[PDB]
RNA sequence: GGAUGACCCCAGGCGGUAGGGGAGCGUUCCCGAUGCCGAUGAAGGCCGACCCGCGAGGGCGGCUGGAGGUAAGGGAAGUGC
RNA sequence: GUGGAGCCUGGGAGUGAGGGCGCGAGCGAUAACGUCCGCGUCCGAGCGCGGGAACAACCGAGACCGCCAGCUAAGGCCCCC
RNA sequence: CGUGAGGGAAAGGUGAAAAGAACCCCGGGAGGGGAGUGAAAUAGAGCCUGAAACCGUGGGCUUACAAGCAGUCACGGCCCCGAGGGGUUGUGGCGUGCCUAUUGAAGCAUGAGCCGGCGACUCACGGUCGUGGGCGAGCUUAAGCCGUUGAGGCGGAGGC
């Protein structure tokens, strides 16, 4: 190879257009049926330790 | 560049570094280097012709004589070296301080009595010069100072 | 009733009560000036060849002024030639009084 | 009435933390708390502390009701950078910039 | 005595940058790019003041051509007939008549028709 | 005084029959109508011409040996991608394209000229679907 | 013409590199100055769509700033990127 | 023949790589956007303007500034124009 | 920094006065919000003034069928200030960066990432022309000496 380099400085408009897909998506959250705390679906609730209507881990 | 404190070493080689070529950091293109065509100690005096000097002095006094601004004094009666005495003499002479005065006299006690007044410039007769005359609005001379002036512009 | 008049090397369509800017006139403010007529229109159509012999427009001079400054710039590449000049065109403002015809 | 809080000279890149701040701009305080808890980014730890400090200021200092608070404004400004050496091959020394952020949250009432 | 740059360069640079407002990118933020843009802008303005007179004359002639051909004759015949009759209304005022006073324009068409 | 500027006007629908017309000499007249240059209030930077409906486009007439000698070309961007179609084949397979191609090349290039081309409606056969607009017949 | 720039009138000119000539603007410092301006706000900074100048520029107004600035007329340069 | 004509005296230069075209020659192969001279021209310095699709030197023509006035030059008048 | 001889930086300013912010609140702290001091705290110690490049938030106009040295001329729409003006740009016309070097460059020839600051025709002594003054068959002093403390005069050796 022979060391490729940028030919021109990237303009402000062009670099910010490249970042048009960079925004984060908020996490998916559902209420816990037992304690009504927001938590990701299909995970054991970290506040009360319930999953599928039964106690799983001690909190 | 020859008088700054830096050494004469070439900072980096002439070719193949990718930088601009340079010698020593004393060169004027460098920040902190020597100065190109800066001031050096200088003598600004020159010999103006004597005839022009004498002609200028006579014209300056004649200019004050045009306007009625030249006054001659036989003697300063009450002036003996106290500032309040000169003020009393100046009041009866018509010098109330509204105009600046060049006071030429060989009387030392008169010169020291008028020195502190902001509107008075004091000169011995040997020191008469056109810059002081033109600066001030009035010219007050002694007869002894007058005779020295006549001899000078002979 | 409108007219086509000639002043300042240009032609203008005028009506009574119109305020018009023309080239500077050697007339004092508040005085009246008369303009040659090329054509009359409206109730009747009179066409000059080139000037309608009897017609004139009465205009009152409101004042004289200077137009907004125009920048006149010149540049020639690779020759160190640059020129900058400000220009303000004088004018005379008229009020059209009546169309005699 | 507005309640603001600023965290200054936080040792984190402004670009990275600006992604987290955009998630909570305009949200209610309750929604903002839940979003930041389960955002898998380092910046969410710092943003949450400023958000909770601003919420305390609203009730404690400015007589604002906690149930009506929402994020009216939020932004990240760049602070002074820390310049560090990174050795490269063949004796070349590079400079690493360790940037810092100022994080502002402003709360209003709905 | 020493006379350093002081404030003179900043004030000159601000004058150029105020003239370059609205230009794209560095053409309104960098003094060097802004000055280059203004060299071309000045030449364009001078050149386009000249051809504005030709642009408008072109517009008037086309409009006169359409009005003439609604009366069964073309532009070149109409202008020749006007000159033969001695009418010196210019194209700017003829175009205004063609669109604002079409009945006066009909009268002028008849004079040009009879003149030839 | 300033030059008159027209306000927006509802546009005119016009019907042209292409039976037996010379192709190029008909296309000139269409291009003038689409530009609206028959109007004393013509303005170069607005779309103010007529909507033009053409019928019997398949019955256009050409002089000389142009039926076998005039070649339309299309380039696909691939190697060897130059396609050549003689006029007689184009008349048989896409009759409307012949008059469309001639008029398009006579319009200004750019956004406004592209809009003007959209106002031309060409049909092979004597019928057109624009009876609601009621195009007035024009003799070319 | 009037009386040497008092302004008017007439005639002809006014693309331009190397280069010759002329006329101006701005910067630092000095005389003017034991003066004048300044806490009712100096210098500097940010604005202006306002005024004067062919132009380089100069005024004026608002905001910021918080202690300096400096005339007409002249002089001297570390004088304009 | 009164012209940014001419002559004389003195101060200050820059230039001393030219190029295209037309005509007259040499060299060359009666080749070169070749080379070397003579006479003119233009570009150089008019990469300012109109025509020649585009284009220093081909045709038109020597740009002090302004105008939404008029006549022309080369070249054009079916549409793009 | 260099084995060494040697090379050789950067870095000044709160306020009149520390009166340099007790105490409370969030926070592990840092930092902040109140309170308090001060004429002033975007004078809070990362401290006078605080330009530009550069980064960001909010608002007005605009943009996803469109061919561009980025402007310019014209018309139209929208927003703002109050007869006019300012901001923005939809469409149409026109349009080959700057500098240098060259017979000739938009040139695919040189230099420049951008901004701020430093950066290049001088001085001394002779000479030669021009010019503002002084004196004129004459003109003029040098070194020094006396005097002043930003005062000048004397000195004719010598030079032309
Ligand atoms: K040193
Ligand atoms: K400088
Ligand atoms: K100020
Ligand atoms: K030649
Ligand atoms: K355009
Ligand atoms: K507008
Ligand atoms: K070269
Ligand atoms: K070369
Ligand atoms: K060459
Ligand atoms: K090269
Ligand atoms: K260069
Ligand atoms: K000399
Ligand atoms: K001399
Ligand atoms: Mg390999
Ligand atoms: Mg390889
Ligand atoms: Mg490889
Ligand atoms: Mg390899
Ligand atoms: Mg590589
Ligand atoms: Mg590469
Ligand atoms: Mg590269
Ligand atoms: Mg490059
Ligand atoms: Mg490159
Ligand atoms: Mg760039
Ligand atoms: Mg880019
Ligand atoms: Mg790049
Ligand atoms: Mg951007
Ligand atoms: Mg882009
Ligand atoms: Mg990109
Ligand atoms: Mg659930
Ligand atoms: Mg040394
Ligand atoms: Mg040495
Ligand atoms: Mg050495
Ligand atoms: Mg040395
Ligand atoms: Mg050495
Ligand atoms: Mg050495
Ligand atoms: Mg070395
Ligand atoms: Mg090298
Ligand atoms: Mg070298
Ligand atoms: Mg290199
Ligand atoms: Mg390199
Ligand atoms: Mg390199
Ligand atoms: Mg490099
Ligand atoms: Mg270098
Ligand atoms: Mg380098
Ligand atoms: Mg470098
Ligand atoms: Mg070197
Ligand atoms: Mg060096
Ligand atoms: Mg040196
Ligand atoms: Mg340096
Ligand atoms: Mg230095
Ligand atoms: Mg140095
Ligand atoms: Mg030094
Ligand atoms: Mg030093
Ligand atoms: Mg030197
Ligand atoms: Mg030197
Ligand atoms: Mg020196
Ligand atoms: Mg020096
Ligand atoms: Mg001297
Ligand atoms: Mg001197
Ligand atoms: Mg002498
Ligand atoms: Mg005194
Ligand atoms: Mg004194
Ligand atoms: Mg005028
Ligand atoms: Mg211009
Ligand atoms: Mg140019
Ligand atoms: Mg140009
Ligand atoms: Mg040029
Ligand atoms: Mg250039
Ligand atoms: Mg160019
Ligand atoms: Mg140049
Ligand atoms: Mg050059
Ligand atoms: Mg050149
Ligand atoms: Mg040139
Ligand atoms: Mg130039
Ligand atoms: Mg000139
Ligand atoms: Mg000028
Ligand atoms: Mg987001
Ligand atoms: Mg991160
Ligand atoms: Mg923190
Ligand atoms: Mg907290
Ligand atoms: Mg920032
Ligand atoms: Mg390494
Ligand atoms: Mg590495
Ligand atoms: Mg490595
Ligand atoms: Mg090493
Ligand atoms: Mg190593
Ligand atoms: Mg690097
Ligand atoms: Mg880095
Ligand atoms: Mg940082
Ligand atoms: Mg912040
Ligand atoms: Mg100083
Ligand atoms: Mg400076
Ligand atoms: Mg400056
Ligand atoms: Mg400034
Ligand atoms: Mg700008
Ligand atoms: Mg701007
Ligand atoms: Mg803009
Ligand atoms: Mg951009
Ligand atoms: Mg920009
Ligand atoms: Mg900027
Ligand atoms: Mg800016
Ligand atoms: Mg340009
Ligand atoms: Mg220009
Ligand atoms: Mg012009
Ligand atoms: Mg032009
Ligand atoms: Mg013109
Ligand atoms: Mg024309
Ligand atoms: Mg149109
Ligand atoms: Mg149309
Ligand atoms: Mg045919
Ligand atoms: Mg055939
Ligand atoms: Mg093939
Ligand atoms: Mg093939
Ligand atoms: Mg293919
Ligand atoms: Mg002249
Ligand atoms: Mg010119
Ligand atoms: Mg001329
Ligand atoms: Mg000239
Ligand atoms: Mg001094
Ligand atoms: Mg002085
Ligand atoms: Mg002094
Ligand atoms: Mg006062
Ligand atoms: Mg103030
Ligand atoms: Mg100063
Ligand atoms: Mg100021
Ligand atoms: Mg100010
Ligand atoms: Mg100003
Ligand atoms: Mg001062
Ligand atoms: Mg002063
Ligand atoms: Mg210098
Ligand atoms: Mg400058
Ligand atoms: Mg001679
Ligand atoms: Mg000279
Ligand atoms: Mg000479
Ligand atoms: Mg010279
Ligand atoms: Mg010479
Ligand atoms: Mg030479
Ligand atoms: Mg020679
Ligand atoms: Mg030679
Ligand atoms: Mg030679
Ligand atoms: Mg050569
Ligand atoms: Mg040669
Ligand atoms: Mg020649
Ligand atoms: Mg030759
Ligand atoms: Mg030829
Ligand atoms: Mg030839
Ligand atoms: Mg030839
Ligand atoms: Mg020939
Ligand atoms: Mg020949
Ligand atoms: Mg021969
Ligand atoms: Mg030959
Ligand atoms: Mg032969
Ligand atoms: Mg040949
Ligand atoms: Mg060639
Ligand atoms: Mg040749
Ligand atoms: Mg020969
Ligand atoms: Mg020859
Ligand atoms: Mg010859
Ligand atoms: Mg020849
Ligand atoms: Mg010649
Ligand atoms: Mg010539
Ligand atoms: Mg020539
Ligand atoms: Mg020519
Ligand atoms: Mg020439
Ligand atoms: Mg040319
Ligand atoms: Mg050219
Ligand atoms: Mg050139
Ligand atoms: Mg060119
Ligand atoms: Mg050239
Ligand atoms: Mg031609
Ligand atoms: Mg040409
Ligand atoms: Mg052409
Ligand atoms: Mg063409
Ligand atoms: Mg061609
Ligand atoms: Mg050409
Ligand atoms: Mg050309
Ligand atoms: Mg030519
Ligand atoms: Mg011309
Ligand atoms: Mg003219
Ligand atoms: Mg004609
Ligand atoms: Mg003709
Ligand atoms: Mg001619
Ligand atoms: Mg036409
Ligand atoms: Mg070491
Ligand atoms: Mg050591
Ligand atoms: Mg070592
Ligand atoms: Mg050591
Ligand atoms: Mg050691
Ligand atoms: Mg060393
Ligand atoms: Mg330092
Ligand atoms: Mg301080
Ligand atoms: Mg202090
Ligand atoms: Mg203090
Ligand atoms: Mg104080
Ligand atoms: Mg606490
Ligand atoms: Mg703390
Ligand atoms: Mg704390
Ligand atoms: Mg806080
Ligand atoms: Mg605090
Ligand atoms: Mg207080
Ligand atoms: Mg207080
Ligand atoms: Mg208080
Ligand atoms: Mg402040
Ligand atoms: Mg302050
Ligand atoms: Mg504080
Ligand atoms: Mg500060
Ligand atoms: Mg500081
Ligand atoms: Mg202070
Ligand atoms: Mg500071
Ligand atoms: Mg500040
Ligand atoms: Mg900025
Ligand atoms: Mg800033
Ligand atoms: Mg920026
Ligand atoms: Mg928005
Ligand atoms: Mg909006
Ligand atoms: Mg889009
Ligand atoms: Mg669209
Ligand atoms: Mg399409
Ligand atoms: Mg586009
Ligand atoms: Mg553009
Ligand atoms: Mg431009
Ligand atoms: Mg426009
Ligand atoms: Mg649109
Ligand atoms: Mg468009
Ligand atoms: Mg367009
Ligand atoms: Mg174009
Ligand atoms: Mg181009
Ligand atoms: Mg060009
Ligand atoms: Mg330039
Ligand atoms: Mg070069
Ligand atoms: Mg050159
Ligand atoms: Mg070359
Ligand atoms: Mg050269
Ligand atoms: Mg040359
Ligand atoms: Mg050659
Ligand atoms: Mg290049
Ligand atoms: Mg290249
Ligand atoms: Mg390139
Ligand atoms: Mg070279
Ligand atoms: Mg270079
Ligand atoms: Mg550059
Ligand atoms: Mg570069
Ligand atoms: Mg550089
Ligand atoms: Mg850059
Ligand atoms: Mg670099
Ligand atoms: Mg930049
Ligand atoms: Mg720069
Ligand atoms: Mg720089
Ligand atoms: Mg800076
Ligand atoms: Mg320096
Ligand atoms: Mg020197
Ligand atoms: Mg000197
Ligand atoms: Mg000398
Ligand atoms: Mg001498
Ligand atoms: Mg000589
Ligand atoms: Mg003289
Ligand atoms: Mg004498
Ligand atoms: Mg004499
Ligand atoms: Mg003195
Ligand atoms: Zn739960």
From Swiss-Prot, chain A:
Keywords: Ribonucleoprotein, Ribosomal protein. InterPro entries: Ribosomal_bL32, Ribosomal_bL32_bact, Ribosomal_zn-bd. Residues 1-29 are annotated as: Disordered. GO terms for molecular function: structural constituent of ribosome. Residues 1-22 have a biased composition (Basic residues). GO terms for cellular component: large ribosomal subunit. GO terms for biological process: translation. Part of the 50S ribosomal subunit. Belongs to the bacterial ribosomal protein bL32 family. Found on the solvent side of the large subunit. This is Large ribosomal subunit protein bL32. It comes from Thermus thermophilus (strain ATCC 27634 / DSM 579 / HB8). The lineage of its organism: Bacteria, Thermotogati, Deinococcota, Deinococci, Thermales.
Swiss-Prot record, chain C:
Keywords: Ribonucleoprotein, Ribosomal protein, RNA-binding, rRNA-binding. One of its GO terms (biological process) is translation. It comes from the Bacteria. InterPro entries: bL21-like, bL21-like_sf, Ribosomal_bL21. One of its GO terms (molecular function) is structural constituent of ribosome. GO terms for cellular component: cytoplasm; ribonucleoprotein complex; ribosome. Belongs to the bacterial ribosomal protein bL21 family. Contacts protein L20. Part of the 50S ribosomal subunit. NCBIfam families: L21. This protein binds to 23S rRNA in the presence of protein L20. Found on the solvent side of the large subunit. HAMAP family: Ribosomal_bL21 (MF_01363). This is Large ribosomal subunit protein bL21. It comes from Thermus thermophilus (strain ATCC 27634 / DSM 579 / HB8). The lineage of its organism: Bacteria, Thermotogati, Deinococcota, Deinococci, Thermales. The gene is rplU.
From Swiss-Prot, chain E:
GO terms for cellular component: ribonucleoprotein complex; ribosome. SUPFAM superfamilies: Ribosomal protein L20. One of its GO terms (molecular function) is rRNA binding. Keywords: Ribonucleoprotein, Ribosomal protein, RNA-binding, rRNA-binding. Disulfide bonds: none annotated. One of its GO terms (biological process) is translation. The keyword Nucleus does not apply. Signal peptide: none annotated. The keyword Ribosomal protein applies. It comes from the Bacteria. Belongs to the bacterial ribosomal protein bL20 family. HAMAP family: Ribosomal_bL20. Binds directly to 23S ribosomal RNA and is necessary for the in vitro assembly process of the 50S ribosomal subunit. It is not involved in the protein synthesizing functions of that subunit. This is Large ribosomal subunit protein bL20. It comes from Thermus thermophilus (strain ATCC 27634 / DSM 579 / HB8). The lineage of its organism: Bacteria, Thermotogati, Deinococcota, Deinococci, Thermales.
From Swiss-Prot, chain F:
One of its GO terms (molecular function) is mRNA binding. It comes from the Bacteria. Belongs to the universal ribosomal protein uL13 family. Pfam families: Ribosomal_L13. GO terms for biological process: negative regulation of translation; translation. Part of the 50S ribosomal subunit. Disulfide bonds: none annotated. The keyword Cytoplasm does not apply. PROSITE patterns: RIBOSOMAL_L13. This protein is one of the early assembly proteins of the 50S ribosomal subunit, although it is not seen to bind rRNA by itself. It is important during the early stages of 50S assembly. This is Large ribosomal subunit protein uL13. Keywords: Ribonucleoprotein, Ribosomal protein. HAMAP family: Ribosomal_uL13. Signal peptide: none annotated. It comes from Thermus thermophilus (strain ATCC 27634 / DSM 579 / HB8). The keyword Zinc does not apply. GO terms for cellular component: cytosolic large ribosomal subunit.
């Amino acid at each position: 190879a022979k060391h490729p380099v940028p030919k021109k400085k990237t303009s402000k408009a062009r670099r910010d257009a490249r970042r048009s897909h960079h925004a984060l998506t908020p996490p998916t959250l559902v209420p816990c049926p037992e304690c009504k705390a927001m938590k990701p679906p299909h995970t054991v609730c970290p506040e009360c330790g319930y999953y599928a209507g039964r106690k799983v881990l001690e909190v | 560049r020859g008088e700054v404190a830096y050494s004469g070493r070439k900072i980096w080689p002439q070719k193949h570094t990718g930088r601009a070529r340079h010698g020593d950091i004393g060169a004027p293109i460098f920040v902190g280097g020597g100065v190109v065509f800066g001031p050096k100690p200088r003598d600004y005096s020159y010999t103006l012709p004597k005839k022009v000097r004498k002609k200028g002095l006579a014209m300056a006094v004649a200019d004050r004589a045009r306007e009625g601004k030249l006054l001659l004094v036989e003697a300063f009666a009450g002036v003996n070296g106290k500032t309040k005495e000169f003020l009393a003499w100046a009041k009866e002479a018509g010098l109330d301080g509204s105009e600046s005065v060049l006071l030429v006299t060989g009387n030392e006690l008169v010169r020291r009595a008028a020195r502190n007044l902001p509107w008075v410039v004091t000169l011995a007769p040997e020191g008469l010069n056109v810059y002081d005359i033109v600066r001030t609005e009035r010219l007050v001379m002694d007869l002894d100072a007058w005779e020295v002036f006549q001899n000078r512009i002979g | 009733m409108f007219a086509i008049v000639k002043t300042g090397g240009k032609q203008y369509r005028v009506e009574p009560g119109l305020k018009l800017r023309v080239e500077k006139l050697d007339a004092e403010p508040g005085a009246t000036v008369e303009l040659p007529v090329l054509l009359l229109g409206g109730e009747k159509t009179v066409v000059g060849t080139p000037v309608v012999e009897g017609a004139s427009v009465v205009a009152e001079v409101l004042g004289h002024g200077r137009g907004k400054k125009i920048l006149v710039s010149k540049f020639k590449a690779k020759v160190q030639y640059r020129r900058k000049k400000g220009h303000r065109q004088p004018y005379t403002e008229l009020l059209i009084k009546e169309i005699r015809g | 009435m507005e309640a603001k809080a600023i965290a200054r000279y936080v040792r984190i890149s402004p670009r990275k933390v600006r992604l987290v701040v955009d998630l909570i701009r305009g949200k209610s305080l309750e929604e903002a708390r839940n979003i930041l808890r389960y955002t898998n980014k380092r910046g969410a730890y710092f943003v949450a502390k400023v958000l909770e400090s601003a919420a305390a200021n609203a009730v404690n200092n400015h007589d604002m009701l906690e149930d009506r608070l929402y994020v009216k404004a939020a932004y990240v400004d760049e602070g002074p950078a820390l310049k560090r050496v990174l050795p490269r091959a063949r004796g070349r020394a590079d400079i690493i910039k360790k940037r810092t952020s100022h994080i502002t949250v402003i709360l209003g009432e709905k | 005595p020493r006379a350093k740059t002081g404030v003179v360069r900043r004030r000159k640079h601000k004058k150029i940058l105020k003239l370059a407002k609205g230009y794209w990118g560095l053409r309104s933020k960098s003094f060097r790019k802004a000055r280059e843009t203004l060299f071309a802008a000045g030449n364009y303005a001078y050149a386009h003041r000249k051809r504005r007179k030709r642009d408008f004359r072109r517009l008037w002639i086309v409009r006169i051509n359409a009005a003439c051909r609604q009366h069964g004759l073309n532009y070149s015949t109409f202008i020749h007939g006007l000159k033969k009759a001695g009418i010196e209304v210019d194209r700017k005022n003829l175009a205004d008549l063609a669109v604002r006073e079409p009945q006066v324009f009909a009268e002028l068409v008849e004079r040009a028709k009879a003149a030839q | 005084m300033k030059t008159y500027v027209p306000k927006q006007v509802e546009p005119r629908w016009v019907l042209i029959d292409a039976e037996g017309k010379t192709l190029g000499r008909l296309a000139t007249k269409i291009a003038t109508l689409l530009r609206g240059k028959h109007r004393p209030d013509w303005t170069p930077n607005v779309a103010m011409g007529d909507f033009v409906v053409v019928v019997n486009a398949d019955k256009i007439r050409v002089t000389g040996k142009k039926l076998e000698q005039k070649i339309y070309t299309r380039y696909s961007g691939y190697p060897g991608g130059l396609k050549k179609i003689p006029l007689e084949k184009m008349l048989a397979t896409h009759p409307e394209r012949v008059l469309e191609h001639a008029v398009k090349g006579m319009l200004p290039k750019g956004p406004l000229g592209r809009r003007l081309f959209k106002r031309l409606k060409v049909y092979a056969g004597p019928d057109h679907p624009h009876q609601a607009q009621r195009p007035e017949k024009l003799e070319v």
